[PDB]
Design a protein around this motif. Structure first.
Motif, PDB file in Angstrom:
ATOM      1  N   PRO A   1      14.822 -39.721  23.076  1.00  0.00           N
ATOM      2  CA  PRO A   1      14.507 -40.584  24.031  1.00  0.00           C
ATOM      3  C   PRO A   1      14.340 -40.014  25.974  1.00  0.00           C
ATOM      4  O   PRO A   1      14.041 -41.098  25.814  1.00  0.00           O
ATOM      5  N   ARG A   2      14.799 -39.106  25.513  1.00  0.00           N
ATOM      6  CA  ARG A   2      14.794 -38.268  26.745  1.00  0.00           C
ATOM      7  C   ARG A   2      12.326 -37.816  26.356  1.00  0.00           C
ATOM      8  O   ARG A   2      12.244 -37.201  28.092  1.00  0.00           O
ATOM      9  N   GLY A   3      11.795 -37.936  26.120  1.00  0.00           N
ATOM     10  CA  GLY A   3      10.965 -37.586  25.107  1.00  0.00           C
ATOM     11  C   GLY A   3       9.824 -36.373  24.141  1.00  0.00           C
ATOM     12  O   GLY A   3       8.515 -35.875  24.589  1.00  0.00           O
TER      13      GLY A   3
ATOM     14  N   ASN B   1      22.241 -42.235  13.503  1.00  0.00           N
ATOM     15  CA  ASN B   1      22.937 -43.695  13.888  1.00  0.00           C
ATOM     16  C   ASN B   1      22.457 -45.118  14.765  1.00  0.00           C
ATOM     17  O   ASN B   1      22.423 -45.719  14.725  1.00  0.00           O
ATOM     18  N   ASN B   2      21.956 -43.772  15.915  1.00  0.00           N
ATOM     19  CA  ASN B   2      20.688 -44.696  16.945  1.00  0.00           C
ATOM     20  C   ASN B   2      19.615 -43.621  17.517  1.00  0.00           C
ATOM     21  O   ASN B   2      19.078 -44.264  18.251  1.00  0.00           O
ATOM     22  N   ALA B   3      19.657 -42.203  16.715  1.00  0.00           N
ATOM     23  CA  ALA B   3      18.555 -40.933  17.479  1.00  0.00           C
ATOM     24  C   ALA B   3      18.639 -40.689  18.713  1.00  0.00           C
ATOM     25  O   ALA B   3      18.178 -40.045  19.740  1.00  0.00           O
ATOM     26  N   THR B   4      19.905 -40.955  19.113  1.00  0.00           N
ATOM     27  CA  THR B   4      20.515 -40.874  20.824  1.00  0.00           C
ATOM     28  C   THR B   4      20.265 -39.406  21.218  1.00  0.00           C
ATOM     29  O   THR B   4      20.677 -38.609  19.997  1.00  0.00           O
ATOM     30  N   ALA B   5      19.895 -38.833  21.849  1.00  0.00           N
ATOM     31  CA  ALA B   5      20.437 -37.118  22.161  1.00  0.00           C
ATOM     32  C   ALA B   5      21.737 -37.133  22.416  1.00  0.00           C
ATOM     33  O   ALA B   5      22.694 -37.584  23.457  1.00  0.00           O
ATOM     34  N   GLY B   6      22.829 -36.067  21.751  1.00  0.00           N
ATOM     35  CA  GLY B   6      24.010 -35.284  21.644  1.00  0.00           C
ATOM     36  C   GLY B   6      24.872 -35.538  21.477  1.00  0.00           C
ATOM     37  O   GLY B   6      25.656 -35.880  20.926  1.00  0.00           O
ATOM     38  N   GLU B   7      23.739 -36.684  19.893  1.00  0.00           N
ATOM     39  CA  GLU B   7      24.906 -37.494  19.045  1.00  0.00           C
ATOM     40  C   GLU B   7      24.954 -36.594  17.292  1.00  0.00           C
ATOM     41  O   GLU B   7      24.332 -35.621  17.538  1.00  0.00           O
ATOM     42  N   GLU B   8      25.880 -37.062  16.533  1.00  0.00           N
ATOM     43  CA  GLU B   8      26.573 -36.524  16.048  1.00  0.00           C
ATOM     44  C   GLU B   8      25.135 -37.171  14.520  1.00  0.00           C
ATOM     45  O   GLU B   8      25.183 -38.535  14.210  1.00  0.00           O
ATOM     46  N   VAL B   9      25.047 -35.693  14.365  1.00  0.00           N
ATOM     47  CA  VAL B   9      24.040 -36.822  12.712  1.00  0.00           C
ATOM     48  C   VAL B   9      25.026 -37.053  11.640  1.00  0.00           C
ATOM     49  O   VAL B   9      25.796 -36.503  11.997  1.00  0.00           O
ATOM     50  N   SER B  10      24.725 -37.383  10.874  1.00  0.00           N
ATOM     51  CA  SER B  10      25.232 -37.930   8.846  1.00  0.00           C
ATOM     52  C   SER B  10      24.452 -37.799   7.965  1.00  0.00           C
ATOM     53  O   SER B  10      22.753 -37.335   8.411  1.00  0.00           O
ATOM     54  N   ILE B  11      24.959 -38.016   7.065  1.00  0.00           N
ATOM     55  CA  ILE B  11      24.715 -38.145   5.807  1.00  0.00           C
ATOM     56  C   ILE B  11      25.087 -39.401   4.413  1.00  0.00           C
ATOM     57  O   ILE B  11      25.746 -41.087   4.740  1.00  0.00           O
ATOM     58  N   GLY B  12      24.047 -39.999   3.949  1.00  0.00           N
ATOM     59  CA  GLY B  12      24.036 -40.656   3.049  1.00  0.00           C
ATOM     60  C   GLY B  12      22.453 -41.549   1.977  1.00  0.00           C
ATOM     61  O   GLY B  12      21.854 -40.772   2.117  1.00  0.00           O
ATOM     62  N   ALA B  13      23.322 -42.274   2.528  1.00  0.00           N
ATOM     63  CA  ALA B  13      20.793 -43.349   1.379  1.00  0.00           C
ATOM     64  C   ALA B  13      20.511 -43.238   2.279  1.00  0.00           C
ATOM     65  O   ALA B  13      20.634 -42.667   3.549  1.00  0.00           O
TER      66      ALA B  13
END
Length: 153
Positions: free
Chosen positions: A33-35, A128-140
């Motif tokens: 979201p910072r570009g 989960n929201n694609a914001t900066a500083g977020e934890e990446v996740s795994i699933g379907a």
């Protein structure tokens, strides 16, 4: 007669890339979201979750990539700061730092990016929201963040 399309197509059936062994980066195709590029970022410790941040060029954001089986599009993953360790997945469906063994991810090109999967194709990397500083996740396979890019350092 003068043209044909019954066994071939373009802009989706005519790629010219397949990756190679070297030093690479992995960032989510949604971008920050910072570009700017939204790169996978090493936690600095073992047996621990991995995170995402806006790319700057640090050793925390740079990685090592080598082919394991073209037969499964699988590749080994290691940080440039700690080539003596690897990245894989466990409980909580988050990618985690692990000892050197045989850990790999399937990396597959798409119509405008890449896709990332465990090796057996049961899950995919997502946000989960694609914001900066977020934890990446795994699933379907996710509806907005289910696509990535792998590119050289």
């Amino acid at each position: 007669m003068g043209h044909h399309h019954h066994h071939h197509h373009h802009s989706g059936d005519s790629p010219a890339v397949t990756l190679s062994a070297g030093n690479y980066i992995i960032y989510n195709r949604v971008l920050s979201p910072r570009g700017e590029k939204l790169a996978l970022t090493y936690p600095g410790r073992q047996r621990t979750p991995v995170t995402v941040s806006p790319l700057d060029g640090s050793s925390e954001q740079a990685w090592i990539l080598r082919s394991y089986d073209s037969n499964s599009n699988t590749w080994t993953i290691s940080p440039v700061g700690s080539p003596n360790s690897q990245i894989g997945w466990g409980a909580g469906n988050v990618p985690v730092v692990l000892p050197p063994n045989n850990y790999v991810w399937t990396l597959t090109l798409t119509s405008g990016g890449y896709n990332i999967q465990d090796g057996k194709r049961t899950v995919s990397w997502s946000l989960n929201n694609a914001t900066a500083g977020e934890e990446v996740s795994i699933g379907a396979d996710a509806t907005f963040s289910g696509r990535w890019v792998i590119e050289k350092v």
